[PDB]
Amino acid sequence: DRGLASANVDFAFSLYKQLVLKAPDKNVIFSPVSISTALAFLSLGAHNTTLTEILKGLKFNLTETSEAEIHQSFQHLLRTLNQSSDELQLSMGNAMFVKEQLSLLDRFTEDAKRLYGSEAFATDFQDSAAAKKLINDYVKNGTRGKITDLIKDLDSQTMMVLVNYIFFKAKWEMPFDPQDTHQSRFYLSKKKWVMVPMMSLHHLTIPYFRDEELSCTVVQLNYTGNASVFFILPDQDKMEEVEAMLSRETLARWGDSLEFREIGELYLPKFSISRDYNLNDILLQLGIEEAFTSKADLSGITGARNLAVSQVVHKAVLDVFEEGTEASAATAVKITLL
Amino acid sequence: TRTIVRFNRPFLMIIVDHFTWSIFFMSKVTNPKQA
Numbered sequence A: 001d002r003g004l005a006s007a008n009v010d011f012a013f014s015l016y017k018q019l020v021l022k023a024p025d026k027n028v029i030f031s032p033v034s035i036s037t038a039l040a041f042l043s044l045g046a047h048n049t050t051l052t053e054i055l056k057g058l059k060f061n062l063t064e065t066s067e068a069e070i071h072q073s074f075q076h077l078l079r080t081l082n083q084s085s086d087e088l089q090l091s092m093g094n095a096m097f098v099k100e101q102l103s104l105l106d107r108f109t110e111d112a113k114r115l116y117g118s119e120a121f122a123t124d125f126q127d128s129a130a131a132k133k134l135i136n137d138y139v140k141n142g143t144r145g146k147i148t149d150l151i152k153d154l155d156s157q158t159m160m161v162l163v164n165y166i167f168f169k170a171k172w173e174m175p176f177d178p179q180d181t182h183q184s185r186f187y188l189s190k191k192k193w194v195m196v197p198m199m200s201l202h203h204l205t206i207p208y209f210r211d212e213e214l215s216c217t218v219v220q221l222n223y224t225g226n227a228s229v230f231f232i233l234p235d236q237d238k239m240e241e242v243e244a245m246l247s248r249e250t251l252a253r254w255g256d257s258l259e260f261r262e263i264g265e266l267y268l269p270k271f272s273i274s275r276d277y278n279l280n281d282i283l284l285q286l287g288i289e290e291a292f293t294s295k296a297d298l299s300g301i302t303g304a305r306n307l308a309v310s311q312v313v314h315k316a317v318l319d320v321f322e323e324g325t326e327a328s329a330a331t332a333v334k335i336t337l338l
Numbered sequence B: 001t002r003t004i005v006r007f008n009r010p011f012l013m014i015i016v017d018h019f020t021w022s023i024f025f026m027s028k029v030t031n032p033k034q035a
Protein backbone atom coordinates (compact mmCIF):
# COMPACT_ATOMS: atom_id res chain seq x y z
CA ASP A 1 0.00 0.00 0.00
CA ARG A 2 2.14 2.88 -1.30
CA GLY A 3 -0.27 5.66 -0.30
CA LEU A 4 -0.44 4.36 3.26
CA ALA A 5 3.32 3.80 3.46
CA SER A 6 3.97 7.34 2.22
CA ALA A 7 1.74 8.99 4.83
CA ASN A 8 2.85 6.64 7.60
CA VAL A 9 6.56 7.25 6.91
CA ASP A 10 6.05 11.02 6.69
CA PHE A 11 4.28 10.78 10.04
CA ALA A 12 7.07 8.63 11.50
CA PHE A 13 9.75 11.21 10.80
CA SER A 14 7.58 14.17 11.87
CA LEU A 15 7.01 12.39 15.18
CA TYR A 16 10.70 11.55 15.58
CA LYS A 17 11.74 15.17 15.18
CA GLN A 18 9.21 16.37 17.74
CA LEU A 19 10.15 13.63 20.19
CA VAL A 20 13.81 14.67 20.00
CA LEU A 21 12.91 18.32 20.48
CA LYS A 22 11.40 17.56 23.82
CA ALA A 23 14.49 15.73 25.14
CA PRO A 24 17.46 16.12 22.85
CA ASP A 25 19.96 13.84 24.47
CA LYS A 26 17.70 10.97 25.54
CA ASN A 27 17.25 7.61 23.89
CA VAL A 28 14.25 7.44 21.56
CA ILE A 29 12.20 4.33 20.85
CA PHE A 30 8.66 4.37 19.48
CA SER A 31 6.43 2.57 17.00
CA PRO A 32 5.14 4.92 14.30
CA VAL A 33 2.74 2.30 12.94
CA SER A 34 1.18 1.79 16.39
CA ILE A 35 0.53 5.52 16.83
CA SER A 36 -0.77 5.90 13.25
CA THR A 37 -3.14 2.96 13.70
CA ALA A 38 -4.39 4.18 17.07
CA LEU A 39 -5.12 7.64 15.69
CA ALA A 40 -6.75 6.21 12.57
CA PHE A 41 -8.93 4.14 14.90
CA LEU A 42 -9.80 7.35 16.79
CA SER A 43 -10.65 9.01 13.48
CA LEU A 44 -13.29 6.35 12.82
CA GLY A 45 -15.38 8.15 15.44
CA ALA A 46 -14.37 11.71 14.49
CA HIS A 47 -16.41 14.18 12.47
CA ASN A 48 -15.92 17.61 10.85
CA THR A 49 -12.83 19.60 11.90
CA THR A 50 -11.84 17.02 14.52
CA LEU A 51 -11.67 14.36 11.79
CA THR A 52 -9.89 16.58 9.23
CA GLU A 53 -7.19 17.54 11.72
CA ILE A 54 -6.46 13.94 12.69
CA LEU A 55 -6.18 12.67 9.12
CA LYS A 56 -4.11 15.66 8.04
CA GLY A 57 -1.90 15.23 11.09
CA LEU A 58 -1.33 11.59 10.09
CA LYS A 59 -0.01 13.10 6.82
CA PHE A 60 -2.77 11.93 4.48
CA ASN A 61 -3.63 14.14 1.51
CA LEU A 62 -7.33 14.71 1.95
CA THR A 63 -7.74 16.16 -1.53
CA GLU A 64 -6.70 12.75 -2.94
CA THR A 65 -8.09 10.12 -0.54
CA SER A 66 -11.15 9.46 1.57
CA GLU A 67 -11.68 8.39 5.14
CA ALA A 68 -13.24 5.21 3.74
CA GLU A 69 -10.09 4.41 1.75
CA ILE A 70 -7.90 5.15 4.77
CA HIS A 71 -9.83 2.83 7.10
CA GLN A 72 -9.82 0.08 4.47
CA SER A 73 -6.05 0.54 4.15
CA PHE A 74 -5.55 0.11 7.90
CA GLN A 75 -7.81 -2.95 7.82
CA HIS A 76 -5.61 -4.43 5.11
CA LEU A 77 -2.41 -3.53 6.98
CA LEU A 78 -3.67 -5.18 10.16
CA ARG A 79 -4.64 -8.35 8.28
CA THR A 80 -1.22 -8.48 6.64
CA LEU A 81 0.72 -7.92 9.86
CA ASN A 82 -1.27 -10.58 11.72
CA GLN A 83 -0.88 -13.21 9.03
CA SER A 84 0.64 -16.49 10.12
CA SER A 85 4.41 -16.78 9.77
CA ASP A 86 6.95 -19.38 10.83
CA GLU A 87 9.87 -16.96 10.45
CA LEU A 88 8.95 -13.87 12.45
CA GLN A 89 6.60 -13.24 15.37
CA LEU A 90 4.56 -10.13 14.59
CA SER A 91 1.21 -9.19 16.05
CA MET A 92 -0.87 -6.03 16.22
CA GLY A 93 -4.15 -5.65 18.09
CA ASN A 94 -6.69 -2.94 18.85
CA ALA A 95 -9.23 -2.77 21.65
CA MET A 96 -11.70 -0.35 23.18
CA PHE A 97 -12.45 -0.23 26.91
CA VAL A 98 -15.74 1.58 27.48
CA LYS A 99 -18.01 2.50 30.36
CA GLU A 100 -20.97 0.14 30.04
CA GLN A 101 -23.56 2.95 30.33
CA LEU A 102 -22.07 4.95 27.45
CA SER A 103 -24.32 4.54 24.42
CA LEU A 104 -22.27 3.70 21.30
CA LEU A 105 -23.48 3.81 17.72
CA ASP A 106 -23.93 0.34 16.30
CA ARG A 107 -22.14 1.59 13.19
CA PHE A 108 -19.12 2.55 15.29
CA THR A 109 -18.72 -0.74 17.17
CA GLU A 110 -19.39 -2.75 14.03
CA ASP A 111 -16.86 -0.70 12.04
CA ALA A 112 -14.32 -0.88 14.90
CA LYS A 113 -14.52 -4.68 14.88
CA ARG A 114 -14.57 -5.02 11.08
CA LEU A 115 -11.86 -2.50 10.18
CA TYR A 116 -9.62 -2.40 13.28
CA GLY A 117 -10.33 -5.82 14.76
CA SER A 118 -11.42 -4.16 18.00
CA GLU A 119 -13.80 -5.58 20.55
CA ALA A 120 -15.58 -3.29 23.02
CA PHE A 121 -14.89 -4.36 26.61
CA ALA A 122 -17.13 -3.06 29.38
CA THR A 123 -14.84 -1.33 31.89
CA ASP A 124 -15.72 0.36 35.19
CA PHE A 125 -13.41 3.38 35.21
CA GLN A 126 -14.80 4.49 38.56
CA ASP A 127 -12.92 1.46 39.87
CA SER A 128 -9.84 3.16 38.49
CA ALA A 129 -7.16 0.78 39.80
CA ALA A 130 -9.04 -2.21 38.38
CA ALA A 131 -9.67 -0.53 35.02
CA LYS A 132 -5.98 0.38 34.84
CA LYS A 133 -4.97 -3.21 35.56
CA LEU A 134 -7.35 -4.56 32.95
CA ILE A 135 -6.03 -2.34 30.20
CA ASN A 136 -2.43 -2.93 31.22
CA ASP A 137 -3.12 -6.69 31.27
CA TYR A 138 -4.50 -6.56 27.74
CA VAL A 139 -1.34 -4.81 26.59
CA LYS A 140 0.86 -7.19 28.60
CA ASN A 141 -0.85 -10.15 26.93
CA GLY A 142 -0.44 -8.70 23.44
CA THR A 143 3.23 -7.81 24.00
CA ARG A 144 4.20 -11.11 25.67
CA GLY A 145 4.86 -9.23 28.90
CA LYS A 146 7.16 -6.61 27.41
CA ILE A 147 4.91 -3.52 27.88
CA THR A 148 3.67 -3.56 31.47
CA ASP A 149 2.60 -0.10 32.56
CA LEU A 150 1.23 1.68 29.52
CA ILE A 151 -1.46 3.25 31.71
CA LYS A 152 -0.01 5.04 34.72
CA ASP A 153 -2.67 7.59 35.64
CA LEU A 154 -6.30 6.97 34.77
CA ASP A 155 -9.04 9.45 35.57
CA SER A 156 -12.01 7.88 37.33
CA GLN A 157 -14.26 9.90 34.97
CA THR A 158 -12.80 8.30 31.85
CA MET A 159 -15.45 7.05 29.40
CA MET A 160 -13.36 5.19 26.83
CA VAL A 161 -9.80 4.11 26.11
CA LEU A 162 -8.72 3.04 22.63
CA VAL A 163 -5.63 0.82 22.68
CA ASN A 164 -3.22 -0.43 20.02
CA TYR A 165 -0.26 -2.73 20.59
CA ILE A 166 2.46 -4.17 18.37
CA PHE A 167 4.71 -7.11 19.21
CA PHE A 168 7.79 -8.02 17.14
CA LYS A 169 10.24 -10.86 17.73
CA ALA A 170 12.67 -11.70 14.96
CA LYS A 171 15.84 -13.69 14.34
CA TRP A 172 18.80 -12.23 12.48
CA GLU A 173 19.49 -13.74 9.11
CA MET A 174 23.16 -13.67 10.20
CA PRO A 175 23.11 -14.04 13.99
CA PHE A 176 25.97 -12.93 16.21
CA ASP A 177 27.97 -15.58 18.02
CA PRO A 178 27.86 -14.83 21.77
CA GLN A 179 31.51 -16.00 21.92
CA ASP A 180 32.36 -12.85 19.94
CA THR A 181 30.55 -10.51 22.35
CA HIS A 182 32.97 -8.58 24.54
CA GLN A 183 32.61 -5.65 26.90
CA SER A 184 33.78 -2.56 25.04
CA ARG A 185 33.50 1.23 25.09
CA PHE A 186 30.40 3.06 23.96
CA TYR A 187 31.19 6.77 23.67
CA LEU A 188 28.43 8.94 25.09
CA SER A 189 30.47 11.92 23.91
CA LYS A 190 33.97 12.33 22.52
CA LYS A 191 35.58 12.10 26.00
CA LYS A 192 33.07 10.08 28.06
CA TRP A 193 32.11 6.45 27.63
CA VAL A 194 30.43 3.50 29.29
CA MET A 195 31.18 -0.20 28.91
CA VAL A 196 28.63 -2.27 26.99
CA PRO A 197 28.54 -5.83 25.63
CA MET A 198 29.62 -5.34 22.03
CA MET A 199 28.58 -8.07 19.60
CA SER A 200 30.51 -8.62 16.41
CA LEU A 201 30.39 -10.26 12.98
CA HIS A 202 33.38 -10.87 10.71
CA HIS A 203 33.61 -10.75 6.88
CA LEU A 204 29.93 -9.97 6.50
CA THR A 205 28.50 -9.07 3.09
CA ILE A 206 25.59 -6.66 3.62
CA PRO A 207 24.03 -3.60 1.95
CA TYR A 208 26.18 -0.59 2.79
CA PHE A 209 26.18 3.11 1.94
CA ARG A 210 28.63 5.79 3.01
CA ASP A 211 26.55 8.97 2.91
CA GLU A 212 28.95 11.81 2.25
CA GLU A 213 26.13 14.39 2.13
CA LEU A 214 25.18 13.74 5.77
CA SER A 215 28.48 12.30 7.07
CA CYS A 216 27.04 8.98 8.17
CA THR A 217 27.31 5.28 7.37
CA VAL A 218 24.17 3.24 6.62
CA VAL A 219 23.94 -0.55 6.71
CA GLN A 220 20.93 -2.83 6.40
CA LEU A 221 20.72 -6.01 8.46
CA ASN A 222 18.05 -8.55 7.64
CA TYR A 223 15.78 -10.57 9.87
CA THR A 224 14.44 -13.91 8.76
CA GLY A 225 11.18 -13.02 7.08
CA ASN A 226 10.19 -9.79 5.42
CA ALA A 227 11.66 -7.40 7.98
CA SER A 228 15.00 -5.63 8.08
CA VAL A 229 16.65 -2.82 9.95
CA PHE A 230 18.53 0.26 8.77
CA PHE A 231 21.35 1.15 11.14
CA ILE A 232 22.66 4.69 10.66
CA LEU A 233 25.95 5.68 12.26
CA PRO A 234 26.57 9.44 12.12
CA ASP A 235 30.15 10.53 12.37
CA GLN A 236 30.97 12.09 15.75
CA ASP A 237 29.00 15.35 16.17
CA LYS A 238 26.93 14.62 13.07
CA MET A 239 23.89 13.10 14.78
CA GLU A 240 22.09 16.45 14.74
CA GLU A 241 22.82 16.85 11.03
CA VAL A 242 21.38 13.42 10.25
CA GLU A 243 18.33 14.07 12.43
CA ALA A 244 17.71 17.41 10.75
CA MET A 245 17.69 15.67 7.36
CA LEU A 246 15.52 12.68 8.27
CA SER A 247 12.62 12.41 5.84
CA ARG A 248 10.95 10.03 3.50
CA GLU A 249 13.16 11.47 0.77
CA THR A 250 16.32 10.76 2.77
CA LEU A 251 15.24 7.22 3.61
CA ALA A 252 14.47 6.61 -0.06
CA ARG A 253 17.88 7.92 -1.07
CA TRP A 254 19.56 5.62 1.47
CA GLY A 255 17.57 2.61 0.24
CA ASP A 256 18.35 3.46 -3.38
CA SER A 257 22.06 3.90 -2.68
CA LEU A 258 22.93 0.69 -0.82
CA GLU A 259 25.52 -1.59 -2.41
CA PHE A 260 26.77 -4.90 -1.12
CA ARG A 261 30.12 -4.74 0.66
CA GLU A 262 32.05 -7.39 2.55
CA ILE A 263 32.54 -5.61 5.86
CA GLY A 264 35.68 -6.60 7.70
CA GLU A 265 34.03 -6.37 11.11
CA LEU A 266 30.67 -5.11 12.31
CA TYR A 267 30.39 -4.16 16.01
CA LEU A 268 26.91 -3.67 17.49
CA PRO A 269 25.94 -3.33 21.17
CA LYS A 270 23.69 -5.77 22.94
CA PHE A 271 21.20 -3.54 24.70
CA SER A 272 17.64 -2.89 25.81
CA ILE A 273 16.01 0.52 26.00
CA SER A 274 12.54 1.75 26.83
CA ARG A 275 10.69 5.01 26.64
CA ASP A 276 7.24 6.28 27.47
CA TYR A 277 5.57 9.40 26.19
CA ASN A 278 2.63 11.72 26.66
CA LEU A 279 1.96 12.61 23.04
CA ASN A 280 -0.46 15.51 23.61
CA ASP A 281 2.10 18.21 22.94
CA ILE A 282 3.45 16.63 19.81
CA LEU A 283 0.01 15.89 18.36
CA LEU A 284 -1.01 19.46 18.99
CA GLN A 285 2.16 20.59 17.21
CA LEU A 286 1.14 18.39 14.27
CA GLY A 287 -2.19 20.21 14.19
CA ILE A 288 -4.42 17.70 15.99
CA GLU A 289 -6.12 20.22 18.23
CA GLU A 290 -9.91 20.07 18.27
CA ALA A 291 -10.00 16.48 19.54
CA PHE A 292 -8.49 17.76 22.82
CA THR A 293 -10.76 20.77 23.35
CA SER A 294 -14.34 21.38 24.33
CA LYS A 295 -14.95 21.83 20.57
CA ALA A 296 -14.15 18.14 20.01
CA ASP A 297 -16.41 16.30 17.57
CA LEU A 298 -16.33 12.58 18.25
CA SER A 299 -20.00 12.19 17.38
CA GLY A 300 -19.27 9.22 15.14
CA ILE A 301 -18.73 7.25 18.34
CA THR A 302 -21.99 8.05 20.12
CA GLY A 303 -24.15 10.14 17.77
CA ALA A 304 -23.58 13.24 19.93
CA ARG A 305 -20.71 15.66 20.59
CA ASN A 306 -20.27 14.31 24.10
CA LEU A 307 -16.67 12.98 24.09
CA ALA A 308 -13.19 14.53 24.01
CA VAL A 309 -9.65 13.16 24.14
CA SER A 310 -7.79 13.73 27.39
CA GLN A 311 -4.44 12.07 26.66
CA VAL A 312 -2.60 10.01 24.07
CA VAL A 313 0.17 7.91 25.60
CA HIS A 314 2.77 5.61 24.08
CA LYS A 315 5.33 3.19 25.48
CA ALA A 316 7.92 1.22 23.56
CA VAL A 317 10.73 -1.24 24.33
CA LEU A 318 13.61 -2.43 22.14
CA ASP A 319 15.89 -5.39 22.92
CA VAL A 320 18.83 -6.18 20.57
CA PHE A 321 20.88 -9.33 21.23
CA GLU A 322 22.90 -12.02 19.47
CA GLU A 323 19.99 -14.10 18.15
CA GLY A 324 17.78 -11.26 16.93
CA THR A 325 15.57 -8.44 18.15
CA GLU A 326 12.46 -8.11 20.29
CA ALA A 327 10.53 -4.87 20.19
CA SER A 328 7.07 -3.92 21.28
CA ALA A 329 4.95 -0.85 21.79
CA ALA A 330 1.48 0.29 22.68
CA THR A 331 -0.58 3.44 22.30
CA ALA A 332 -3.64 4.47 24.27
CA VAL A 333 -6.15 7.26 23.59
CA LYS A 334 -8.00 8.24 26.78
CA ILE A 335 -11.41 9.84 26.24
CA THR A 336 -13.70 11.71 28.66
CA LEU A 337 -17.17 13.15 28.59
CA LEU A 338 -17.67 16.60 27.13
CA THR B 1 41.88 -2.69 4.13
CA ARG B 2 38.28 -3.74 4.73
CA THR B 3 35.68 -1.34 6.07
CA ILE B 4 34.95 -1.55 9.80
CA VAL B 5 31.49 -0.47 10.97
CA ARG B 6 31.66 0.09 14.73
CA PHE B 7 28.47 1.22 16.53
CA ASN B 8 30.28 2.63 19.57
CA ARG B 9 28.68 6.10 19.52
CA PRO B 10 25.06 7.26 19.19
CA PHE B 11 23.23 5.75 16.25
CA LEU B 12 19.79 5.33 14.69
CA MET B 13 17.74 2.20 14.00
CA ILE B 14 14.75 1.97 11.69
CA ILE B 15 12.97 -1.40 11.68
CA VAL B 16 11.07 -1.78 8.40
CA ASP B 17 8.79 -4.27 6.70
CA HIS B 18 9.68 -4.99 3.09
CA PHE B 19 6.17 -6.19 2.34
CA THR B 20 4.07 -3.26 3.60
CA TRP B 21 6.87 -0.61 3.80
CA SER B 22 5.76 0.04 7.37
CA ILE B 23 8.18 1.46 9.86
CA PHE B 24 7.56 -0.80 12.82
CA PHE B 25 10.00 0.97 15.16
CA MET B 26 12.31 3.96 15.09
CA SER B 27 15.05 4.47 17.62
CA LYS B 28 17.96 6.65 18.59
CA VAL B 29 20.43 4.97 20.94
CA THR B 30 22.39 7.71 22.73
CA ASN B 31 23.23 5.54 25.73
CA PRO B 32 22.52 1.78 25.72
CA LYS B 33 22.60 1.86 29.57
CA GLN B 34 20.73 5.16 29.97
CA ALA B 35 18.69 5.29 33.18
Ligand SMILES: C[C@]12C[C@H](O)[C@H]3[C@@H](CCC4=CC(=O)CC[C@@]43C)[C@@H]1CC[C@@H]2C(=O)CO
Residues within 6 Å of the ligand: A002, A005, A006, A007, A009, A248, A251, A252, A253, A255, A256, B016, B017, B018, B021, B022
Ligand atom coordinates in the same frame (compact mmCIF):
# COMPACT_ATOMS: atom_id res chain seq x y z
C1 LIG C 1 13.72 1.23 1.92
C2 LIG C 1 12.42 0.58 1.40
C3 LIG C 1 12.01 1.11 0.02
C4 LIG C 1 11.55 2.58 0.07
O1 LIG C 1 12.65 3.45 0.13
C5 LIG C 1 10.55 2.85 1.24
C6 LIG C 1 10.96 2.24 2.61
C7 LIG C 1 9.80 2.31 3.55
C8 LIG C 1 9.32 3.73 3.64
C9 LIG C 1 9.04 4.34 2.31
C10 LIG C 1 7.79 4.63 1.96
C11 LIG C 1 7.47 5.34 0.73
O2 LIG C 1 6.32 5.52 0.37
C12 LIG C 1 8.64 5.88 -0.03
C13 LIG C 1 9.75 4.85 -0.06
C14 LIG C 1 10.15 4.34 1.35
C15 LIG C 1 11.23 5.24 1.98
C16 LIG C 1 11.25 0.79 2.36
C17 LIG C 1 11.64 -0.04 3.58
C18 LIG C 1 12.44 -1.21 3.00
C19 LIG C 1 12.52 -0.97 1.48
C20 LIG C 1 13.78 -1.59 0.92
O3 LIG C 1 14.81 -1.78 1.53
C21 LIG C 1 13.73 -2.05 -0.52
O4 LIG C 1 14.82 -2.93 -0.63
